[PDB]
């Protein structure tokens, strides 16, 4: 979580490149800082039932 906070506060610095995307595989737990959660786009993946 601390290094993730460091990453998210670093991300506020502008990255001029347009095709650069940063995908972060994630676990659904409250220990993640809320700052990154609010800053970046969120997707949720679930195991289909059956």
């Amino acid at each position: 979580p601390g290094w993730l906070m460091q990453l998210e506060k670093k991300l506020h610095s502008l990255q001029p490149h347009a095709c650069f995307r940063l995908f972060l595989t994630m676990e659904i737990n409250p220990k993640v800082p809320v700052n990154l959660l609010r800053a970046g786009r969120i997707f949720v993946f679930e195991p289909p039932p059956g």
């Binding site: 095709c19 595989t25 949720v44 993946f45």
Partner: protein, 149 residues
């Protein structure tokens, strides 16, 4: 109607929970007693006394596609009023189907395509190409025991 839907059905009362229909149980009867206080029906015991077909509707596999007009008020020609009354009635009888009926109340209020996108698996090739700024990190949360990489 919404106030009764959210919390108005959780009120407390003294008596009146007598069973009338052998197919209608005590919890359903007590829910009827709650729903009776809403003037949008003004009577429910009398309606279920007649129309024995209601009992069959009480055991249907999907008893939300077709629902009898137990409310006896001014005609809800607008589909929204009919949908919300039927949704409250479904909350009364067979609450398990509620969610399914919930979908209907959304659909008739937003078209029969509103939630169809979520049913189809997503394709990120359009989401990350345009809708995602290069400064925004795309987080992919995964339920424990599953990987989205």
């Amino acid at each position: 109607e919404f106030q009764h839907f959210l919390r108005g059905n959780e009120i407390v009362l003294s008596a009146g929970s007598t069973p009338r229909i052998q197919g209608l149980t005590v919890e359903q009867a007590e829910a009827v007693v709650r729903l009776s206080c809403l003037p949008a029906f003004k009577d429910l015991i009398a309606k279920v006394q007649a129309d024995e077909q209601f009992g069959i509707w009480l055991d249907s596999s999907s008893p939300e596609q077709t629902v009898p007009y137990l409310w006896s008020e001014e005609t809800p020609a607008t589909p929204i009023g009919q949908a919300i009354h039927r949704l409250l009635l479904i909350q009364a009888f067979r609450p398990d189907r509620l969610l399914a009926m919930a979908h209907m109340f959304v659909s008739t209020n937003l078209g029969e395509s509103f939630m169809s996108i979520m049913e189809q698996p997503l394709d990120l090739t359009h989401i990350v190409g345009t809708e995602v700024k290069p400064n925004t990190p795309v987080l992919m949360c995964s339920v424990p025991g599953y990987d989205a990489s």
